[PDB]
Each structure stands twice: as C-alpha cells, then as structure tokens.
Ligand SMILES: *[C@@H]1O[C@H](CO)[C@@H](O[C@@H]2O[C@H](CO)[C@@H](O[C@@H]3O[C@H](CO[C@H]4O[C@H](CO)[C@@H](O)[C@H](O)[C@@H]4O)[C@@H](O)[C@H](O[C@H]4O[C@H](CO[C@@H]5O[C@H](CO)[C@@H](O)[C@H](O)[C@@H]5O)[C@@H](O)[C@H](O)[C@@H]4O)[C@@H]3O)[C@H](O)[C@H]2NC(C)=O)[C@H](O)[C@H]1NC(C)=O
C-alpha cells in the first residue's frame with residue numbers, strides 16, 4: 250500500500266538531488282579549472298550544504314518501510330539514499346575533511362620544480378614539463394633528480410594532512426557502520442567475495458607480468474649498464490618512462506622484442522599532419538557516432554577545457570570527465586597534448602562522457618556506473634581499437650607498416666607494457682590505502698609500507714634511498730585527490746571482456762581465423778558493437794553490475810579469461826625468449842626504504 254506514495258517520494262527526491270548536485274558540481278568545476286582561495290571556499294561551502302541535506306534524506310528514509318517492499322527497484326533506490334558516505338560526519342568534522350581534501354589536491358596541482366640544468370628556472374610543472382623529461386630522457390641522473398624533486402613536493406609535503414584525512418575517512422565509514430573506508434569503497438561492487446575474486450584473477454596473470462618484468466630488466470641492463478640496473482634486484486622505477494612506473498610504453502623504443510622491425514609511435518605523424526586537441530576530440534566523437542552511439546552535445550564544445558590555459562593560473566591538469574546532472578551538460582577538462590598516448594586519453598575520457606549521456610534519463614541515484622570499473626572501461630575498449638595497426642593505417646597515422654610475425658610481437662609487447670604492467674600497480678594503490686584505513690599499519694611504518702607493496706607486487710623501487718622521513722604515496726594524483734583506484738584494476742580486466750565480445754559482434758575476431766586476430770580488431774563503424782554498449786550503458790546503476798555485463802554479452806562473471814586470450818601469443822613467444830636468453834625472473838627484497 251505504502252509503495253505507491255514511496256514511488257512518488259522517490260521521483261521528486263531524485264530530481265531534487267540532481268538539481269542540488271548540479272550546483273555542487275559547478276563549484277567543483279570552477280575550482281579545478283581555476284584554483285584560488287575564493288573558489289576553494291565556494292566549493293567546500295556548497296558541499297557542506299548538500300551534506301546537510303543528505304543527512305535529512307537518510308533520516309527521512311526511516312519513515313518508509315522500504316525493506317518490506319515488493320518492488321526490487323524501489324528498494325534499490327531507497328538503499329542508495331541511506332548511504333551517506335562522508336555526509337554522515339558531524340558538521341564540523343565534514344568541514345575539516347573538505348578543508349584537508351582541498352589542501353592535498355591543491356598542493357598536488359601547484360607543484361613546481363627547478364630545471365635540472367638551470368637552478369634559476371623554477372616553474373616546471375608535472376604536466377607538461379616534468380612528464381616530458383620522465384618520458385623522453387635517458388639520462389638516469391636527470392631522471393632521478395626529477396623523481397626526487399617531485400615526490401618531495403607532491404608526497405612528503407602533505408603527510409600531516411593525509412594523516413588527518415585517514416582519521417576522518419575512518420570516522421565517516423564507521424558512522425555508516427562499515428569497518429573502515431576500505432569496506433565503504435568495496436560496497437560499490439556489491440559482492441562480498443570481490444577482493445578474493447581479484448586475488449584469484451591477479452594470481453593467474455602474475456606469471457606473465459613476471460616474464461615481462463624480467464625481459465624489460467634484461468633490456469634496461471644493456472642500455473644503462475649493470476651499475477644502474479642489477480640482474481637480481483627490483484627495477485629502479487625512474488627508468489620506466491613514467492613518474493609512478495604505472496605503464497612502461499614510453500621506453501618501448503629501448504625494450505622492444507624486435508628493434509629492427511616497426512614499433513607503432515604515431516606522435517610524430519600527428520604533429521606532421523597538424524593535429525590539434527580540437528581535432529583529437531572531434532575524432533573521438535567520430536568514433537562513438539560511427540558505432541551508432543551518441544554525438545557530443547553543444548554544451549560539451551562550449552564549456553569543455555581541452556588545452557592548458559595560457560594565463561598564470563593554477564589548475565588541476567589531471568584529465569577528467571564531468572556530469573552536471575541536467576540534460577546534455579557534460580564536460581571534459583584535459584590539458585591535451587598531441588601524442589599517441591594523449592589520443593588514447595581523449596578516448597578514455599570520452600568514454601565517461603558517453604556513459605553520462607547514455608544514462609541521463611535514469612533517476613538520479615542510477616546516474617552512475619554499474620560499478621566504478623565499468624565507467625573506467627568504456628573509453629579503453631575504443632582505445633584498444635584505436636591502438637591497432639588496422640585503425641591507425643585507416644586514419645593515415647601509420648605509414649609503410651608490414652604486419653609480419655615480428656611486428657605483431659612488438660605491438661603485443663607495446664600493449665602489454667600498458668595493460669599487464671598496470672595490473673600490480675593498480676592493485677597496490679588500494680591495497681596500501683585499505684591497510685591504512687583498516688588500521689593495519691602503525692603510523693611509524695606508513696612510508697615503507699607503501700614501498701614494500703610496490704616491491705612485492707611490481708618489483709620496482711625508488712631511484713634513491715627513502716625512509717619514514719619521506720611520504721611518497723600522495724605523489725600519485727588519485728592518492729592526493731581521494732579517488733578510489735580499484736576501479737582501474739577492475740577496468741583493465743573487464744575491458745578485455747568488453748573488447749573480445751564487441752570484436753566478435755563486429756565480425757572482427759574469430760579464434761580460428763588467422764586473418765582476424767584479437768590484437769588487430771577495429772570496432773570503428775560497428776553498429777552491432779555500439780548496440781551492446783547502448784544496452785549496457787543505458788542501464789546506469791539501475792541493476793547490480795552482473796546484470797549490466799549480461800546485457801552486453803550474456804555473461805555475469807568478472808573473468809581474466811579474455812585478457813589472457815589477448816596476450817596468449819605474447820606469452821608463448823616471451824616464455825621462449827626468456828629461456829633462450831637465460832633471463833633472470835623475480836627479484837630480491839628492495840633496500841630503498843630504511844626503517
Ligand atoms: C549503525 O548501527 C547502530 C547500532 O550499532 C545504529 O544505531 C541504532 O539505531 C537504532 C534505530 O534503528 C536505534 O534504535 C532505537 O532505540 C531507541 C532507544 O535507544 C536509546 O537507548 C539506548 C540504550 O538502550 C541508547 O544506546 C541509544 O543511544 C538511545 O538513547 C528506541 O526508542 C527506538 O524505538 C523506537 O523506534 C522503533 C522503530 O523500529 C521499527 O518501528 C516500526 C514502527 O513503524 C515497526 O513496524 C518495525 O518493526 C520496527 O520495530 C519502534 O519499534 C519503537 O516503537 C520506538 O518508536 C529504536 O529502537 C538505536 O538506539 C541506535 N543505537 C544503538 C546503540 O543501538 C545506527 O542506526 C546504524 N547506522 C546506520 C547508518 O545504519
């Protein structure tokens with residue numbers, strides 16, 4: 250009987266929540282686009298206001314006997330409304346948390362270092378100045394300089410703020426009756442065996458990672474010499490072409506299986522053909538529409554920031570996509586550069602935008618991903634296609650390419666330097682934070698606990714000796730910005746399930762046809778692949794994620810089968826190559842974090 254009035258209650262509340270969240274998002278956008286004390290105050294004050302309203306909402310749900318209802322849909326919506334998160338904190342505690350959070354994100358965004366060759370020039374930012382050096386320099390001491398300068402300023406500088414953040418995050422979780430923030434995050438996956446599932450999948454892929462690790466270390470020894478890289482120790486991370494060693498594709502030119510054969514790097518051809526950020530976004534838009542998916546609305550073009558501002562202002566340059574919870578008001582903020590990697594990043598961010606557009610008709614509480622990993626996967630599925638020789642030849646970015654057996658191994662290896670390498674990295678980001686949230690590590694051991702995990706899982710280490718005098722975790726954007734990271738591990742697994750199925754649907758993959766390998770599938774122009782996306786993305790969070798996966802390809806289980814299938818030709822070649830070259834596998838425990 251009560252369910253009739255409850256349905257009307259939800260309809261109104263959802264629309265109210267969308268409108269109130271719109272206001273919060275606008276202030277958060279203004280701050281990220283233009284970091285000032287006034288914008289910080291505005292963002293945080295509006296968030297405090299919404300938090301207060303959320304408290305009233307959660308209190309009001311107790312007036313409805315929602316757990317007694319017949320409708321699974323009504324119950325699911327009511328359950329979503331009971332989950333306050335940080336808004337469960339007392340007014341003062343919430344205000345303090347907001348203040349600490351903006352302190353950490355603004356610190357990260359404002360980091361500037363001095364030029365290695367010119368101690369007078371001290372306006373080098375991570376994006377683009379420091380990352381330019383990290384990705385391109387092969388001077389190991391230059392690399393170590395920039396690593397140390399960045400981590401000292403982006404990491405160590407916010408230890409006290411990070412400590413208070415952990416305290417209030419924990420207090421918030423417990424007010425929602427989760428054990429810690431780890432459980433609060435994991436609740437988004439609606440599966441009480443989710444951690445164990447990921448341990449199992451990770452364990453299956455781990456041997457391949459160790460083969461890649463071993464081979465890369467071998468190749469780095471030939472380049473830098475044994476004084477810089479040892480055979481038996483963890484790889485010094487500053488040599489891996491990335492500030493966090495999360496992906497190694499930037500060093501592919503020195504570690505590629507067949508150096509005399511083609512290695513795909515289209516950055517130069519993009520510049521030669523006069524690519525701009527605008528063109529890159531237009532091309533991303535073209536890819537989605539070619540699949541019979543939704544075109545970018547005018548608000549996107551009018552309101553997005555697709556180049557780093559040329560005035561003196563501070564901003565968050567870490568790429569992001571934004572939903573404003575109205576109709577068609579969606580935006581990206583990216584400090585775009587004309588590179589191959591950046592072309593993939595454009596497609597990644599546009600994947601978020603497409604998800605927003607696909608579910609914008611859903612009630613507010615359902616206007617989010619089936620789970621956080623789904624949201625991160627969408628654009629990467631297209632990026633996998635964009636990265637293929639097949640696609641890059643179509644758009645004239647890859648010229649005179651001969652796809653023989655050796656070129657194929659080079660391309661598979663290049664992909665693995667991004668996709669397999671990332672897996673242990675992503676797992677450690679949340680394994681670390683979970684252990685702090687759960688109170689499993691004493692504050693006296695917080696820094697070496699981070700590096701111990703990086704060692705154990707990724708077999709990498711800092712370029713210089715660190716200690717508990719340093720605090721390196723917040724040097725990663727997501728750690729300073731309090732963004733859950735497990736979403737990316739989930740993404741990198743499930744995106745291959747989505748890719749394999751989309752490719753099969755597009756007639757682009759057949760396991761028994763040598764002419765249709767998975768690693769050269771291009772889903773561009775495929776309405777059938779697009780249909781599967783529409784079927785899944787339009788659901789938003791209206792159903793538990795296995796139902797969303799089922800809508801795409803009929804499966805209900807997160808599985809490492811597809812990613813293993815993609816890389817199987819590489820696994821076979823690499824295992825043999827490592828044996829042929831007597832390549833040492835595994836690593837001794839690092840000496841780079843002193844207790
Ligand atoms: C996280 O877990 C917390 C517990 O660990 C939990 O906190 C509990 O929430 C309960 C509300 O669900 C609350 O229960 C109420 O307790 C009142 C008295 O408690 C006082 O004394 C306690 C000592 O004994 C103190 O420790 C407390 O601090 C309090 O000072 C009761 O008066 C109250 O009762 C009324 O409400 C119930 C409603 O229950 C339903 O009512 C409908 C009728 O519409 C029934 O049809 C239905 O079957 C059901 O019974 C009525 O039944 C009753 O007639 C009264 O009107 C109520 O029991 C509890 O006090 C509180 N703390 C503790 C320590 O237990 C948090 O809520 C959890 N947080 C989240 C976010 O989930």
Ligand SMILES: *[C@@H]1O[C@H](CO)[C@@H](O)[C@H](O)[C@H]1NC(C)=O
Pocket residue numbers: 283285286287288560562
């Ligand atoms: C940044 O914010 C300030 C006030 O905080 C505002 O006056 C200014 O217009 C903004 N700058 C830009 C470039 O938008």
Ligand SMILES: *[C@@H]1O[C@H](CO)[C@@H](O)[C@H](O)[C@H]1NC(C)=O
Pocket residue numbers: 541776777783
């Ligand atoms: C394009 O999508 C519409 C609905 O969104 C669908 O009806 C149509 O079949 C699609 N086009 C093709 C060629 O499949």
Ligand SMILES: [Zn+2]
Pocket residue numbers: 597598601624625
């Ligand atoms: Zn993303």
